[PDB]
Amino acid sequence: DAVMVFARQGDKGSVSVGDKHFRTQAFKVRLVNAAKSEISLKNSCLVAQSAAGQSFRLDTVDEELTADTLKPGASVEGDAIFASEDDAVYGASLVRLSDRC
Amino acid sequence: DAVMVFARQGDKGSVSVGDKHFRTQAFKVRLVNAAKSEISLKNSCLVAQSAAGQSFRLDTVDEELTADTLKPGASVEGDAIFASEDDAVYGASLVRLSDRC
Amino acid sequence: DAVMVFARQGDKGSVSVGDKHFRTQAFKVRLVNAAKSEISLKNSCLVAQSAAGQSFRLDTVDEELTADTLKPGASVEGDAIFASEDDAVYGASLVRLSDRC
Amino acid sequence: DAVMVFARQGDKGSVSVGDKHFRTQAFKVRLVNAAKSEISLKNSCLVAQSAAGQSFRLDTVDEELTADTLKPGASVEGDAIFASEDDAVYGASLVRLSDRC
């Protein structure tokens, strides 16, 4: 009765504007409903984090990953790009769903 | 009189379901029998490990790598994906055959 | 009223001549003027740096990235390759524009 | 009056046979004679090393990189794969020519 989250580490990068800087870590994410009922994602969000429990904000995400619900057997996929001001986001090793959004 | 194991580090990733999380390290593996006799793999398994001797469970493996035997000169290849709950598996640097399966 | 700098970490490398050695980190860089006025880059330069503020010299850069100005909505892109004598440049995680050139 | 050595870090890997294991780091190497005279490479060899000066044996190399000489303007390229028993070779960041072969 929970959505399955598959992530693969992608490109590392940065964004700078004047003296405002941040680092980025991209993941290719696939969400899969392997249960027998429709699961709502409306009050859920994607969080990337280190094994120590440090989490990182989502900077940009492909529209497909923001589906409100996932019917049984349905799958959505796309890129999700997380950020930190420093280089901490490079240690993000897990993408998961939170309901604290 | 042992099978040769060639591995190349591939993608780093993760799998999450509810609050059950793990990290993944993929390798492309090739097994080669460079001896003069057939070698049995029936009671052998692929293990990934760090240089310090810490080993990691095999989460998924391509069917081709689970051949029961390898005749002389035979070669099989495919992906093998190992896991840890935390990010330890990212230090797996060796794939080898164990007979403790 | 500042140019936006998008960078993605690319190849790691080295250059050696006799006993003169250095390490290289490439980035794909895109510069974007998202403001309403033309912005001059004539006295600006690309700097790569670590989160701790350690910066690295630019060894080579694609001609497209050395435009003197960027009109509104204009974008230029190319590779930029930064260097260190030791392996410090591998921790460069940000490309930004400096006006101290 | 020295050959120029350009290297780019490639795949990380391993080789195992029975309980004999090693780790591998591949580089794409290009050798370039940018001088005005023919330079002999007959008593030279490719060495990979860390910034601290730790060096690693050459396990395999493409035939093209073992040219005996390089005439003016000549260039040769190919892959070179270096090894360590443990995972030290993963810190090799420089390929250079030695005359101690």
PDB file of N, CA and C in Angstrom, chain C residues 40-76:
ATOM      1  N   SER C  40      27.277  43.367 -20.305  1.00  0.00           N
ATOM      2  CA  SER C  40      28.650  43.203 -20.819  1.00  0.00           C
ATOM      3  C   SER C  40      29.414  42.155 -19.995  1.00  0.00           C
ATOM      4  N   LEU C  41      30.176  41.307 -20.710  1.00  0.00           N
ATOM      5  CA  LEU C  41      31.057  40.262 -20.140  1.00  0.00           C
ATOM      6  C   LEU C  41      32.528  40.549 -20.418  1.00  0.00           C
ATOM      7  N   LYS C  42      32.800  41.727 -20.992  1.00  0.00           N
ATOM      8  CA  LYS C  42      34.151  42.067 -21.474  1.00  0.00           C
ATOM      9  C   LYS C  42      35.170  42.061 -20.346  1.00  0.00           C
ATOM     10  N   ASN C  43      34.784  42.553 -19.179  1.00  0.00           N
ATOM     11  CA  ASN C  43      35.684  42.472 -18.043  1.00  0.00           C
ATOM     12  C   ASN C  43      35.314  41.396 -17.020  1.00  0.00           C
ATOM     13  N   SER C  44      34.662  40.340 -17.501  1.00  0.00           N
ATOM     14  CA  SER C  44      34.348  39.201 -16.672  1.00  0.00           C
ATOM     15  C   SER C  44      35.051  37.940 -17.141  1.00  0.00           C
ATOM     16  N   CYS C  45      35.185  36.983 -16.235  1.00  0.00           N
ATOM     17  CA  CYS C  45      35.791  35.692 -16.559  1.00  0.00           C
ATOM     18  C   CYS C  45      35.127  34.577 -15.761  1.00  0.00           C
ATOM     19  N   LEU C  46      35.242  33.349 -16.283  1.00  0.00           N
ATOM     20  CA  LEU C  46      34.692  32.161 -15.661  1.00  0.00           C
ATOM     21  C   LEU C  46      35.702  31.648 -14.652  1.00  0.00           C
ATOM     22  N   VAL C  47      35.218  31.349 -13.440  1.00  0.00           N
ATOM     23  CA  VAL C  47      36.015  30.820 -12.334  1.00  0.00           C
ATOM     24  C   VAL C  47      35.275  29.559 -11.846  1.00  0.00           C
ATOM     25  N   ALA C  48      36.036  28.487 -11.623  1.00  0.00           N
ATOM     26  CA  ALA C  48      35.523  27.283 -10.988  1.00  0.00           C
ATOM     27  C   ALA C  48      36.075  27.226  -9.573  1.00  0.00           C
ATOM     28  N   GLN C  49      35.275  26.727  -8.653  1.00  0.00           N
ATOM     29  CA  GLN C  49      35.669  26.713  -7.237  1.00  0.00           C
ATOM     30  C   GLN C  49      34.959  25.650  -6.430  1.00  0.00           C
ATOM     31  N   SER C  50      35.590  25.312  -5.308  1.00  0.00           N
ATOM     32  CA  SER C  50      35.032  24.436  -4.302  1.00  0.00           C
ATOM     33  C   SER C  50      34.101  25.233  -3.379  1.00  0.00           C
ATOM     34  N   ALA C  51      33.243  24.535  -2.625  1.00  0.00           N
ATOM     35  CA  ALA C  51      32.345  25.174  -1.656  1.00  0.00           C
ATOM     36  C   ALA C  51      33.105  25.942  -0.560  1.00  0.00           C
ATOM     37  N   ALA C  52      34.341  25.521  -0.275  1.00  0.00           N
ATOM     38  CA  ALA C  52      35.197  26.239   0.675  1.00  0.00           C
ATOM     39  C   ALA C  52      35.795  27.539   0.118  1.00  0.00           C
ATOM     40  N   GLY C  53      35.543  27.882  -1.151  1.00  0.00           N
ATOM     41  CA  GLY C  53      36.099  29.094  -1.740  1.00  0.00           C
ATOM     42  C   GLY C  53      37.463  28.984  -2.365  1.00  0.00           C
ATOM     43  N   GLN C  54      37.921  27.763  -2.661  1.00  0.00           N
ATOM     44  CA  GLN C  54      39.197  27.589  -3.342  1.00  0.00           C
ATOM     45  C   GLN C  54      38.914  27.605  -4.857  1.00  0.00           C
ATOM     46  N   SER C  55      39.613  28.470  -5.585  1.00  0.00           N
ATOM     47  CA  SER C  55      39.357  28.600  -7.019  1.00  0.00           C
ATOM     48  C   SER C  55      40.471  28.069  -7.899  1.00  0.00           C
ATOM     49  N   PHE C  56      40.136  27.817  -9.167  1.00  0.00           N
ATOM     50  CA  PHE C  56      41.041  27.083 -10.082  1.00  0.00           C
ATOM     51  C   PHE C  56      41.119  27.803 -11.410  1.00  0.00           C
ATOM     52  N   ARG C  57      42.326  27.839 -11.972  1.00  0.00           N
ATOM     53  CA  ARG C  57      42.529  28.559 -13.219  1.00  0.00           C
ATOM     54  C   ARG C  57      41.809  27.876 -14.379  1.00  0.00           C
ATOM     55  N   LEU C  58      41.398  28.687 -15.343  1.00  0.00           N
ATOM     56  CA  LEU C  58      40.802  28.221 -16.580  1.00  0.00           C
ATOM     57  C   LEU C  58      41.899  27.883 -17.567  1.00  0.00           C
ATOM     58  N   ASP C  59      41.993  26.618 -17.980  1.00  0.00           N
ATOM     59  CA  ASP C  59      43.080  26.187 -18.865  1.00  0.00           C
ATOM     60  C   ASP C  59      42.687  26.407 -20.335  1.00  0.00           C
ATOM     61  N   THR C  60      41.506  25.931 -20.713  1.00  0.00           N
ATOM     62  CA  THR C  60      40.977  26.126 -22.071  1.00  0.00           C
ATOM     63  C   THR C  60      39.486  26.370 -22.010  1.00  0.00           C
ATOM     64  N   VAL C  61      38.962  27.043 -23.026  1.00  0.00           N
ATOM     65  CA  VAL C  61      37.519  27.386 -23.080  1.00  0.00           C
ATOM     66  C   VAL C  61      37.061  27.494 -24.517  1.00  0.00           C
ATOM     67  N   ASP C  62      35.862  26.997 -24.828  1.00  0.00           N
ATOM     68  CA  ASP C  62      35.309  27.122 -26.182  1.00  0.00           C
ATOM     69  C   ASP C  62      35.052  28.606 -26.497  1.00  0.00           C
ATOM     70  N   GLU C  63      35.395  28.999 -27.735  1.00  0.00           N
ATOM     71  CA  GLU C  63      35.278  30.410 -28.218  1.00  0.00           C
ATOM     72  C   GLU C  63      33.907  31.032 -27.881  1.00  0.00           C
ATOM     73  N   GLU C  64      32.845  30.214 -27.974  1.00  0.00           N
ATOM     74  CA  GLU C  64      31.481  30.718 -27.777  1.00  0.00           C
ATOM     75  C   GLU C  64      31.254  31.347 -26.398  1.00  0.00           C
ATOM     76  N   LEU C  65      31.990  30.864 -25.386  1.00  0.00           N
ATOM     77  CA  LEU C  65      31.866  31.340 -24.028  1.00  0.00           C
ATOM     78  C   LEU C  65      32.605  32.648 -23.751  1.00  0.00           C
ATOM     79  N   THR C  66      33.359  33.123 -24.720  1.00  0.00           N
ATOM     80  CA  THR C  66      34.128  34.356 -24.575  1.00  0.00           C
ATOM     81  C   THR C  66      33.486  35.552 -25.329  1.00  0.00           C
ATOM     82  N   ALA C  67      32.186  35.461 -25.615  1.00  0.00           N
ATOM     83  CA  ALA C  67      31.391  36.616 -26.124  1.00  0.00           C
ATOM     84  C   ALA C  67      31.608  37.847 -25.244  1.00  0.00           C
ATOM     85  N   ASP C  68      31.742  39.010 -25.872  1.00  0.00           N
ATOM     86  CA  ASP C  68      31.954  40.264 -25.148  1.00  0.00           C
ATOM     87  C   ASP C  68      30.679  40.747 -24.478  1.00  0.00           C
ATOM     88  N   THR C  69      29.539  40.425 -25.060  1.00  0.00           N
ATOM     89  CA  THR C  69      28.301  40.848 -24.469  1.00  0.00           C
ATOM     90  C   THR C  69      27.252  39.782 -24.750  1.00  0.00           C
ATOM     91  N   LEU C  70      26.186  39.835 -23.964  1.00  0.00           N
ATOM     92  CA  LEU C  70      25.017  39.004 -24.106  1.00  0.00           C
ATOM     93  C   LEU C  70      23.751  39.879 -24.087  1.00  0.00           C
ATOM     94  N   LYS C  71      23.119  40.017 -25.256  1.00  0.00           N
ATOM     95  CA  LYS C  71      21.867  40.764 -25.381  1.00  0.00           C
ATOM     96  C   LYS C  71      20.748  40.012 -24.635  1.00  0.00           C
ATOM     97  N   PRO C  72      19.618  40.701 -24.348  1.00  0.00           N
ATOM     98  CA  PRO C  72      18.479  40.078 -23.631  1.00  0.00           C
ATOM     99  C   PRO C  72      17.968  38.813 -24.276  1.00  0.00           C
ATOM    100  N   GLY C  73      17.807  37.758 -23.486  1.00  0.00           N
ATOM    101  CA  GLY C  73      17.385  36.472 -24.016  1.00  0.00           C
ATOM    102  C   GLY C  73      18.472  35.665 -24.701  1.00  0.00           C
ATOM    103  N   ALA C  74      19.663  36.245 -24.927  1.00  0.00           N
ATOM    104  CA  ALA C  74      20.748  35.516 -25.611  1.00  0.00           C
ATOM    105  C   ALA C  74      21.351  34.448 -24.675  1.00  0.00           C
ATOM    106  N   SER C  75      21.879  33.400 -25.284  1.00  0.00           N
ATOM    107  CA  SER C  75      22.454  32.269 -24.560  1.00  0.00           C
ATOM    108  C   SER C  75      23.715  31.817 -25.336  1.00  0.00           C
ATOM    109  N   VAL C  76      24.807  31.494 -24.642  1.00  0.00           N
ATOM    110  CA  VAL C  76      25.953  30.903 -25.280  1.00  0.00           C
ATOM    111  C   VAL C  76      26.357  29.657 -24.481  1.00  0.00           C
TER     112      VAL C  76
END
